Design a protein around this ligand. Structure first.
Ligand SMILES: Cc1cc2nc3c(=O)[nH]c(=O)nc-3n(C[C@H](O)[C@H](O)[C@H](O)COP(=O)(O)O)c2cc1C
Ligand SMILES: Cc1cc2nc3c(=O)[nH]c(=O)nc-3n(C[C@H](O)[C@H](O)[C@H](O)COP(=O)(O)O)c2cc1C
Ligand SMILES: Cc1cc2nc3c(=O)[nH]c(=O)nc-3n(C[C@H](O)[C@H](O)[C@H](O)COP(=O)(O)O)c2cc1C
Ligand SMILES: Cc1cc2nc3c(=O)[nH]c(=O)nc-3n(C[C@H](O)[C@H](O)[C@H](O)COP(=O)(O)O)c2cc1C
Ligand SMILES: Cc1cc2nc3c(=O)[nH]c(=O)nc-3n(C[C@H](O)[C@H](O)[C@H](O)COP(=O)(O)O)c2cc1C
Ligand SMILES: Cc1cc2nc3c(=O)[nH]c(=O)nc-3n(C[C@H](O)[C@H](O)[C@H](O)COP(=O)(O)O)c2cc1C
Ligand SMILES: Cc1cc2nc3c(=O)[nH]c(=O)nc-3n(C[C@H](O)[C@H](O)[C@H](O)COP(=O)(O)O)c2cc1C
Ligand SMILES: Cc1cc2nc3c(=O)[nH]c(=O)nc-3n(C[C@H](O)[C@H](O)[C@H](O)COP(=O)(O)O)c2cc1C
Ligand SMILES: Cc1cc2nc3c(=O)[nH]c(=O)nc-3n(C[C@H](O)[C@H](O)[C@H](O)COP(=O)(O)O)c2cc1C
Lengths: 185, 176, 176, 183, 185, 176, 183, 183, 176
């Protein structure tokens, strides 16, 4: 299983780091990371990790301006892509198909190859434009997994919420997060 | 100021309790609470409070089946409504106009009177139907304020995230 | 009052410079300027001023690449935004939501927060694409105030036409 | 070349007058003028000219209520039409196809024959209805040429703006008015 | 507060007269009336007032063919417009934007300036065209306030129904009709 | 039977005159004629008749400006309406609902009451706008019976073509 | 000039024949004819001519089933196409893009190359499906020219109507057939 | 004739080079080239030529970031534009109207002036977003000319395919490159 | 594996012949060929082969008129279908659902059963109609794999271009 992990400059960099950490604990999974310029800023602000620390969580890390990277090619097989978190700018770019950098190009390629795209859109409030773009991509089979907190499993800390979101994102690829707190009835 | 607060059976009952607690501190605000049947289950499961405790946080607590409540009529003036959290079922009913209980009727009335409606939709993932319904209501000027965690202010506890969302919902009505 | 003034590389930088001069005559208004890269080219070709001169007309002048500026945050309260003049490319980015820089990000934020956005779109002719984008934004309550000459008040000079457009743009925020 | 020129009651009668003057200097262009009722009001308020003065600038002048004029039939060949300036009411009538007078009829005819219609829409602000109407006609190949002032060529007077607008309108028919290059 | 009051040739002229009467009793409110040709006919048929009697209820009255009236200009500030009753022809004109007379022009101007437009559409049955036009304008924020009778407050006379409609129309401008019979529970 | 016959200023007044002559041969049919201003021009250019002659072919001839005529009321029962011929402008007014005169008002009323409307649209070529308007009305059950020549029955004269169109128009109301 | 002329099984074979005769009088126009199967039936029933007679009126006559004809490729340059008259079935095939025979293929080719397609649609009444199909092609710049009789020029015979229709069809290609003025 | 030629970072730089060479053989055609950043990468990887070599094939070469170039204004008359090959990113930018660089701007200008835009879209497979974008521009009269190989004329080399594509692109402007007939 | 391979009369019969040759090198794949009437013309003009030669490349070759063939039944399990090359007319028939022959019927069945359909659409230029039909089918999950030349791997011959297209078509079914 080869997964692309795009990270983007929406607040919620801890979500990306945690997903990358959980992926690192699965040996059957090769990860290709692309951090946008603004994701690097957000990682540094919101987590104790640097961008290089996060890059080291992945098997491969590609430059966001590098349209000649492996994952820019359709013939280079992957099982899909997660953008976490996904900003409104990146969301809008993917919907329009304006593949100006590698996050956008890798996403455009994933879609043309029929591979799974999972977005973790984060913004509040959501406007009509945000919702239009989300719907357009949803109709195409793109999974929309905003980081909405669950309270039924009695979370206490931010980590509790992050890990639940990560588990529910991973569900999209039939992957089992080993600390998921699921509904029992 | 008169505000309708709808509570609904989406996970996130602490979101609604906290908004009610904040509003309680504002004497200038008259609150009209409508807890759905499933919001009572979610409150009692996810909070240390009972439905009756939450009811006591509001100036009025209308029965979710009472289509004869003051707020069911457009002639009764309010400043608008918040549904927090808002389930996909309730969202869908509002979009369709299928006003079969008081949460749905109050919302339909708010919309027909040109009053402010603010929804706190909570579901994950969001499907095509959810997004269709959300989009259609957004085009009508309904505020969509999902409980999206912000990390730029370095939250530590669930209370931190809850506090942030409530502050932003309050913002929709110029409240601090 | 807090107003964001975006300047964009459409011909008509004198419209933007004149608006900022008129705002500087109002001591109660805090102005946040964002000049695009091409707006600087246009200012220097069409006005007596340099980019620095125009920057000095506003309380703040943010870098058009700086997505961390105050006005990129929703929680930072403003009374809205004017893009004057507004090129088709900027208009297109806003309609699409492709918030690549601060003009785009500030606009996207103004819209999500339900604040007032006023665009001064300048292009001739207007293509199908231009009108599509204008129509979509208009349905959302975005004011479209193109710099259309009025001849009923018998203008004589360019300044007369400029002044009239500015006053009507100002009029959107109930200003004289 | 045969061109229909419609004038309409939006502010900007000076734009229509200057177009007719520019077309008057071109011998192998036959102009057919239709001034709307409210255009006469706008001409007289905004220019030093009377209605008859403006009518004299064109080869033919047709009554706005005359649905039996030459230009109201598609069998009468022309090279197209300019409405300058074009009010929101006239723009809406054309979009709807409600051809109540000659301006609407001629425009409707130009469209059905597949000839070139150029509109000079003027209103501010532009509402949702305005934009909807403009977009629907744009999709049909109707040129939308609002009188948007250019500043890159350093205008000083109203005339500078008016003549530039006229030049860019004329461009639609490949006609040269007596521009951007490098920087 | 400056309000434009358009009247139109749908049955229901008593609704217009009553709204104008109620407005006359509010000194903070300047009214600009435009009666269509057919409204004049309807006023004379349905009320004991003449058109001039109704004109005298307003602070200003403009000619329906007068595209040069104050209210035809956007720069002339008003707080909005009510068309009461609003015929299907007038409704259709406003939706198409075919601003052929002053009722239509003043309405078109109100919409371009972002001011409040309140329509009191009256026709029965409603056809697909009526409904299309009503919806198009509704999506733009135009208030659709058809004169539908309420029976919960136990009306007895036509006046009872007229005054309730008028009160509910006035609600659109935050104005208080002093004889409103509101729902008490 | 009560039928409204609208005449409109499209070329093809002989189609309208012939329809009225054929109806006058049916003693059970009460005809309500409304000739538009331009229909009078067309009748006088294309037929041997004057406006008065054509008016005398029907039981009633209402003034095209008279919005108070019997047929302007829905409660006044009719079996429907034919517009023959129907110009694009009249077709456009009906589709838009801009019922400025009696032809338009009578049509708008026929539609709201669910009565049968038959249009004989005449124009060549048919533009996008014309087809839009025709399609919209067609979706509502409005019959579109343009005066299309049939050559299978070997016509020789204009009257043969005219007669065939009239019979097929008549056929809409199960008439011979 | 190279023009494709398609004929189709709507009533109005006399319209197609008269178009070919008018084009035959024009030396610098090369006509390519495609008669549909049902058009041959309509020609023989409605005219004094046989199928071969009509084929002789054109420079080239292609089999309606021949998808290998010159006109079935976009590399073979023409100035466009007229389908006269055009049945609802053929109109629907073109709209759908279901280019089963040469009439549909040539029309599909004309469209993809951005050349001028003119249709002479004939049916009565017109249904919702007819109008939908006509509208969709109209939006793409396809001229819709139904054979609508004009009466203002005082016709007496069927020929008068036929020749006027032909003249107005030819107008689409700027060709003059051997009209409205004033009143 | 004045033609804008845009080159873009889709595979198929040989297609753009061959178009410029073919246009170079035509004296009364003035070509304005705009190579995108990624097009230079594609040229160098896929051809024996450098960026400067290709720029020398055109009369004018404009920087892709230069929004002040002659071709960025509608007052500067051209006969239209070819983007060859056209990436999905550039195709999407044009459709959206997001005219961030000169390729997008010139294309946006060509469209607003009603001049002819021809795109040579290349990607495989084509996604829903690609097709949506292509369709929206097609509706506006933008020619969509993907580099689809023909086999009926029996090609042997890559050059055979390239030159046929070029010929069919040129067809859009009525230019003859130095085809199907019968069977 | 069971694969349906439709061949259609677009130029590019060498693409279809090459695909069938590549499949014949895979012993686990049962191929069901349907050559259209015009595909036979194209094969004989563009390849060294006759229709019989191409038929012999597949396990089954069904008559393009035979709506009773095995693959016309949904209950007959397959892994999907490739149309290579796919003309605009065939593409149009599939999008419309006008399943007049076996290529159309087999495709309509593949879609109703939720099996994979891969079209190799070949035409230049692509008109509005072509793109409409392609877009509609694409929204349903139909893969659009037009024979687009790739120059990054430095091809020299027609066979190089052909081979690359085939491998990417194959790639849709996870084949080499
Ligand atoms: C600290 C901070 C927080 C931000 N949070 C969000 C957010 O949650 N949602 C969003 O759409 N953009 C957010 N942005 C704005 C984006 O970072 C900006 O639009 C940027 O251009 C995104 O580019 P990228 O998607 O390529 O990373 C934030 C920016 C800053 C600096
Ligand atoms: C503990 C629990 C959590 C739930 N969370 C959600 C949720 O997050 N989003 C949602 O749409 N529905 C959620 N539901 C399901 C809704 O309660 C259910 O659709 C119900 O019909 C909603 O009715 P109501 O909106 O009137 O309260 C949840 C149910 C349970 C019991
Ligand atoms: C002098 C000159 C005049 C221009 N005028 C316009 C114009 O009026 N409308 C427009 O959309 N673009 C115009 N542009 C092109 C834009 O500058 C270009 O699209 C640029 O990318 C806009 O970027 P921005 O919106 O961030 O400023 C002009 C460019 C130049 C230099
Ligand atoms: C002097 C004055 C200025 C006007 N300016 C405009 C204008 O700028 N745009 C517009 O749409 N209408 C404008 N109008 C209103 C129109 O004249 C009015 O809608 C009229 O019905 C148009 O009719 P017409 O298009 O047949 O001329 C103006 C009216 C007056 C008297
Ligand atoms: C007495 C009478 C009652 C009418 N009632 C209505 C009605 O309720 N609804 C409607 O749309 N038109 C009604 N009309 C028809 C309109 O008056 C007619 O369409 C007229 O053209 C409207 O023009 P106006 O809107 O400019 O006044 C009525 C007409 C008459 C004479
Ligand atoms: C002799 C002549 C022939 C006309 N023929 C047509 C026609 O066939 N189709 C059309 O839409 N308008 C035609 N018109 C133009 C209309 O008469 C014009 O649009 C008029 O405003 C229609 O108004 P009415 O529908 O109320 O009669 C013709 C006009 C003249 C005088
Ligand atoms: C003599 C007769 C008259 C016909 N007239 C028409 C007609 O007016 N309009 C139409 O759409 N079809 C008409 N048809 C039916 C068509 O001929 C039939 O749909 C046929 O399949 C058309 O095929 P084609 O377009 O390939 O010629 C007529 C058929 C017959 C035999
Ligand atoms: C050699 C290689 C081949 C590429 N081929 C294509 C292609 O076939 N189609 C496409 O849309 N993008 C292709 N790309 C990706 C684009 O180059 C990338 O999206 C870039 O941002 C396009 O920018 P531009 O249109 O300004 O040149 C390719 C990239 C590389 C490095
Ligand atoms: C040699 C030649 C090449 C053709 N090339 C194409 C083409 O590339 N695209 C297309 O849509 N049709 C093409 N056709 C036309 C089709 O063969 C025609 O539309 C036929 O009806 C298709 O039917 P089918 O899809 O059942 O094979 C070509 C025809 C000939 C004979």
């Amino acid at each position: 299983m080869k997964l692309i992990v795009g990270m983007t400059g929406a607040t919620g960099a801890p979500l990306g780091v945690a997903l990358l950490q959980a992926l690192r604990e699965m040996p059957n999974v090769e990860t290709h990371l692309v951090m946008s310029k603004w994701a690097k800023t957000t990682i540094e602000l919101e987590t104790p990790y640097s961008a290089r620390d996060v890059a080291a969580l992945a098997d491969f890390s590609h430059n966001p301006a590098d349209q000649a990277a492996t994952i820019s090619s359709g013939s280079f097989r992957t099982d899909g892509m997660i953008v976490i978190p996904c900003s409104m700018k990146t969301l809008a770019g993917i919907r329009a198909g304006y593949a100006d950098g590698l996050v956008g190009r890798a996403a455009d390629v994933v879609l043309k190859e029929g591979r799974k795209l999972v977005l973790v859109p984060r913004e509040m409030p959501l406007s009509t434009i945000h919702l239009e773009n989300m719907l357009a991509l949803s109709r195409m089979g793109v999974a929309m997994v905003p980081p909405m907190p669950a309270f039924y499993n009695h979370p206490e800390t931010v980590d509790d919420i992050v890990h639940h979101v990560v588990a529910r994102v991973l569900d999209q690829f039939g992957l089992e997060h080993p600390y998921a707190r699921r509904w029992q009835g």
